[PDB]
Amino acid sequence: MTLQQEIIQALGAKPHINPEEEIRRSVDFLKAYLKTYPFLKSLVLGISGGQDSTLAGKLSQMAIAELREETGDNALQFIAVRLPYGVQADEQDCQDAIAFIQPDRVLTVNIKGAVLASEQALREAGIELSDFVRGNEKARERMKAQYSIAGMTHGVVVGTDHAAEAITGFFTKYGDGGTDINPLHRLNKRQGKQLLAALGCPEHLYKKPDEAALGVTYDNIDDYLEGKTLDPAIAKTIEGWYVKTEHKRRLPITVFDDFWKR
Amino acid sequence: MTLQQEIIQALGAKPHINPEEEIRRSVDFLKAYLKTYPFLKSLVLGISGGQDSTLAGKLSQMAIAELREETGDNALQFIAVRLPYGVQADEQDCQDAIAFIQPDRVLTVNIKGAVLASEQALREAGIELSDFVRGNEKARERMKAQYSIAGMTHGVVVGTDHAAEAITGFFTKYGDGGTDINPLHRLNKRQGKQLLAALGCPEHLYKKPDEAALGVTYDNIDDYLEGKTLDPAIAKTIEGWYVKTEHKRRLPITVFDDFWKR
Ligand SMILES: NC(=O)c1ccc[n+]([C@@H]2O[C@H](COP(=O)([O-])OP(=O)(O)OC[C@H]3O[C@@H](n4cnc5c(N)ncnc54)[C@H](O)[C@@H]3O)[C@@H](O)[C@H]2O)c1
Ligand SMILES: NC(=O)c1ccc[n+]([C@@H]2O[C@H](COP(=O)([O-])OP(=O)(O)OC[C@H]3O[C@@H](n4cnc5c(N)ncnc54)[C@H](O)[C@@H]3O)[C@@H](O)[C@H]2O)c1
C-alpha cells in the first residue's frame, strides 16, 4: 500500500460523490446521534461566512428542523456563534451565510479581551508570544466559547473538519480541532462546493497567492485525495505535512501506541 | 466479554505492577519520543502539588536529565508551570513537589484574568455561566497556557491522565484532557502511589466525604480496575460513568464510527 492509499483510506475520501446522497448522509448522522442521547438539545457551531462553516451550519439546521418536526420538541435548537476578534465591523459574507442558513439562534462573542488577557498573564510570567502562536491562541479561545455555550444549552459542538483540511494538519490542535461531531469528515474541498450548490447556497460564499500550502493549490490537494498522480514535488510536500501532523489526528500518545516509531 | 473486561482492556490496567519497571517504562517512553522528533526540546507540565502531577513531573524531569547527559544537548528542558486561579497565596504542597522534582524551569501563570474576560464576553452575548461550567472553563484556560508555552519552546504538553481518572471521564474535554503525551496511562491510583514511594517522594504528597464519585471510593475504582467483583450498586455506578463519557476517550465523531450506536 502506498502512502497516498493510506492517507485516502484514513480520511475516508472517494474520487466521486453524489451530492444529494452526501447531504442526506450528514443530516441523518446528526439526527441519529441526537436521538441516541435524548438529553442533548442543541447543535453549536462557530460561523464566519466561509465555505466550511456555511455548509456545516446548513446541514445542522436541517437536522434540528427535521427532528423538531418529527418529535414535536421545541427545545431542539441550532445555535450559530459569531466569534470575531475585536469590534471589527460587520462582514457581509457572514450576514449572507446567516440569511441562507436561517439559524434558530445567533450569538456573538468577542474573543479579543480573553486572548489579550491570556497574553498579559504570559507576559508577567516572562513569555512574549509571537503573532503565529497568538493565532493558535485565538482558535483555542473560539473552542472555549463554543464549549461554554454547549455546557449551558445541553449542546454538542459541530466541527467543520474535512479531508482537504485534515490531510495537511492545517488546523489548531484543541482549537478548531477540538469538537464533538464532524459531519463534513470524508469530503474534499470541491466536493463541499458541490453540496453547497445542491443546497442553493449563494455562489459568492464558496466560488473561488491563493494556495493551500507553499506550492500546493486546493485543486492539487483534492486531486491527490481523489487518487490522481501529481508532480513528485507536490506529492512529497503534501505527504510531508501529513506525516508531520499525525499527532493532530490521533488521541494523546500512550506507551501502547506504535504509529510514531521509526 | 463482560463490560468490566472491556473497560480494563481499553485502559490497559493490570492487577499488579512492578514499580521500578513502570518508572523505567514511562521515562524511556518519553525519551524515545523526544529522540524520534529531535526538533522538540521541552516537556511542559502544569504542577499543583497533587499526586498525579508530582509523579508525571518527576518522570519528565528524569527523561530530560538523562537525554541531556546522553546527547550533550543543553537546550533540553523540563518546564513546570504553576497555574493558580487568582493571587491566592503560595501553597506548601506545590513547593514541596517542586523541591522533590528539581525542575529545570518553573513558570507561574495566573489564569484568573483570562477566565473572567471569557465570562464577560459571554455575559454581553446574553449567556451567564454557572459555577460548574466555569470550572471547565478554568481547565481549558490551563490547557491554553501550556500550549502557548509549548509553542514558544519547541515543547510537548505532558498529561497526567491514568486509568482511575479515565474510567469515569472525570476530566474536562479539551481541558486537562487536551495533552500531547500521557506517561501515566495504564496505572490505577494506588499504583501511582507505589511509583512515588519507589522514587522517594515525601509521603504527605500522596498519602491519604473523600470519594471518587457518589458512593464510590478510589479503593473501589482501583479494585474494579484490578478485576475484582464489587457490590453491584458500585459496579453499576462506575459502568454508568464509563458509558456516558465514551465521547471523552474518542476522537471527534464521524459518519464512519459505530461505537455510539444502539
Ligand atoms: N502553509 C500553511 O498555510 C500552513 C503551514 C503550517 C501550519 N498552518 C497553520 O498554522 C496553525 C497551526 O500551527 P501549529 O501546527 O504550529 O500549532 P498547533 O498548536 O496546532 O500544533 C503545535 C502543538 O502540537 C504539539 N506537537 C508538536 N509536535 C508534536 C509531536 N510530534 N507530537 C505530539 N505533539 C506535538 C505541541 O504542543 C505544539 O505546541 C494552523 O492555523 C494551521 O492551519 C498553515
Ligand atoms: N462525581 C464527581 O466527582 C464528578 C461527576 C461528574 C463530573 N465530574 C467533573 O465535572 C467536570 C467535567 O464536567 P463535564 O463532563 O460536564 O464537562 P466537559 O466539558 O468535560 O464535557 C461536556 C461537554 O462534552 C460534550 N458532550 C456531552 N455529551 C456528549 C456526547 N454524548 N457526545 C459528544 N459530546 C458530548 C459537550 O460539548 C459538553 O459541553 C470535570 O472536572 C469532572 O471531573 C466529577
From Swiss-Prot, chains A, B:
Residue ranges the record marks as coiled coil: none
UniProt cross-references to InterPro entries, sorted A to Z: NAD/GMP_synthase (IPR022310), NAD_synthase (IPR003694), NH(3)-dep_NAD(+)_synth (IPR022926), Rossmann-like_a/b/a_fold (IPR014729)
One MF term in the entry's GO annotations: ATP binding
The EC number(s) this enzyme carries: 6.3.1.5
GO cellular component: cytoplasm
UniProt key word Disulfide bond: no
Catalytic activity: deamido-NAD(+) + NH4(+) + ATP = AMP + diphosphate + NAD(+) + H(+)
GO BP field: NAD biosynthetic process
Residues reported to bind ATP: G46, I47, S48, G49, G50, Q51, D52, S53, T160, K189
PANTHER family reported for this sequence: NH 3 /GLUTAMINE-DEPENDENT NAD + SYNTHETASE, NH(3)-DEPENDENT NAD(+) SYNTHETASE
Oligomeric form and interacting partners: Homodimer.
Biological role: Catalyzes the ATP-dependent amidation of deamido-NAD to form NAD. Uses ammonia as a nitrogen source.
Name of the molecule in the record: NH(3)-dependent NAD(+) synthetase
Higher taxonomy: Bacteria, Pseudomonadati, Pseudomonadota, Gammaproteobacteria, Enterobacterales
Gene that produces this protein: nadE
